[PDB]
Amino acid sequence: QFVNKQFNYKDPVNGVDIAYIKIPNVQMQPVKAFKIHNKIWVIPERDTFTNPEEGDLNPPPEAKQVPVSYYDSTYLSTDNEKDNYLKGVTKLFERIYSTDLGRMLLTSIVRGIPFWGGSTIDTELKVIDTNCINVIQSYRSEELNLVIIGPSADIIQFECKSFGLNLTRNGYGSTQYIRFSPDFTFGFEESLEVDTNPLLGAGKFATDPAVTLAHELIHAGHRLYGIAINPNRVFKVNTNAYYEMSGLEVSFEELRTFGGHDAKFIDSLQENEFRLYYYNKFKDIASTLNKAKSIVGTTASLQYMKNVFKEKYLLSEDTSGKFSVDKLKFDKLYKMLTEIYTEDNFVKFFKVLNRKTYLNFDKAVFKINIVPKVNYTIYDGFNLRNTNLAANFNGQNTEINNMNFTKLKNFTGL
Ligand SMILES: *SCCCCCC(=O)NO
Ligand SMILES: [Zn+2]
């Protein structure tokens, strides 16, 4: 069991795993937060904190808005919504952990401690302060890897924010703040030709939000190991005439995260270039660890932190105590994080209906309520065993299971 406490939003603060917290630096008032697992926290609040550019929840000027956007400044403003948000997110982590692939991914994420690259002197290993949160009581700072937070103004923009050396792309990693909601999901079409056409389909089938969360956690895995691909390296889509009409550009990072046939649109040569780039980053980390002869702070010993990063990066260690990067082990970890952890593989483990490509067109956004077990379960999602929803993905079929879905906006035609 991944989350061994059944938190309620109104549970009293204890300063340990239910607490008021602040983000170092950041303006922000303390927010009630919940530690659901080692290194992983949930803040059931709309994100007005991580980006100074984004404090308001009202829509920007309409000329500013993308077509696939959805605003509702009232969402997640009440205690009952935050209770259901917290319970919904924990339920989705348990659904992910109930699969072997999700257990692997979540183990990688917990082991993926952001590197202690904060020192200005080679002989000292030091934390980077923005990979911590401040737990209020006086305050005490504590390292963490992942925070799930409510969305900012655009509810369906599930961006990842972090503070930063380009930490998500230099091998170091940084604490990831994932904007996410378990209370909404997207509709897609069961025919591929319809799903990849911007003019057709109303969104008959609903994405299982466990797949959406797993998709975001895959990105967070890349980012915590500092191997995310530069967002400006993109596929200028020439396989979908409507992508080419609209000139839609999709980053290699997305195509990698979806996996399946999409990842083959990254050419072998540019993939080798990324692989060599990140291999060299891991070598620099080994070199940094070898120069460090003392540790800064009171939380852990030098030899404990060297071993934490040996385990994170799969470093080899010679009989003199010196670390190095073995290409066979680097390739195994890199492939694990980039080719084994993919959306397409999660669909296989969950046995759900899902989009077949990232290169489609979104159809609709639905309100959902996955907290009741009569609606959704850790092991079956919407497709509840021993009911009329168990077969043929009937629980994801928004026409059969219509009481579980409220369509809020249509995107077809926009
Ligand atoms: S977690 C990295 C940014 C995620 C942006 C939303 C997304 O994953 N869309 O496919
Ligand atoms: Zn993505």
Q: Where are the beta strands (DSSP E) in 144-256?
A: 146-150, 160-161, 176-179, 184-188, 205-206, 234-236, 249-251
- Cα of 105 vs centre of ligand 2, distance in Å, is 16
User: Which parts are annotated binding residues for Zn(2+)?
Assistant: 215, 219, 254
| SS3 state at 258 | helix
Q: How far apart are CA 345 and CA 349, in angstroms?
A: 7
Q: How far apart are CA 50 and CA 54, in angstroms?
A: 8
- The number of beta carbons lying within 10 Å of the beta carbon of residue 206 is 27
Atom of ligand 1 nearest to the CA of 220: 1
- The number of beta carbons lying within 10 Å of the beta carbon of residue 353 is 23
Which structure tokens are listed for 280?
């060299």
Q: How far is CA 64 from the centre of its chain?
A: 25
222 lines ligand 1 (CB under 6 A): no
Residue 134, beta-bridge partner list: 22, 141
159 lines ligand 1 (CB under 6 A): yes
355 lines ligand 1 (CB under 6 A): no
Dihedral pair phi/psi, residue 188, rounded to 5° = -135, 170
Please, what sign has the CA dihedral across residues 167, 331, 218, 125?
negative
**Which residue reads 């080719």 in tokens?**
339
Atom of ligand 1 nearest to the CA of 228: 2
262 lines ligand 1 (CB under 6 A): no
| Reduced DSSP (H G I as helix, E B as strand, rest coil) percent helix, strand, coil of the chain, to 5 | 35, 20, 50
Give which of 152, 135, 136 is closest to 144, Cα–Cα: 135
Give, using CA atoms, the residue closest to atom 4 of ligand 1: 159
Which 3-state string (H, E, C) describes 109-160? HHHCCCCCECCCCCCEEECCHHHEEEEECCEEEEECCEEEEECCCECCCCCE
From 158, 176, 234, the mutation candidate for ligand 1 (largest count of ligand atoms within 8 A of CB) is 158
According to the entry, how was the structure determined?
Answer: X-ray
Are 145 and 128 a contacting pair, CB within 8 Å? no
Query: In the chain, what are the domain boundaries?
Result: 1-414
Catalytic residue among 94, 189, 216, 343: 216
Q: Where are the beta strands (DSSP E) in 208-263?
A: 234-236, 249-251
Active site residue 216: yes
Ligand with smallest separation from the Cα of 159:
1
- Cα of 109 vs centre of ligand 1, distance in Å, is 16
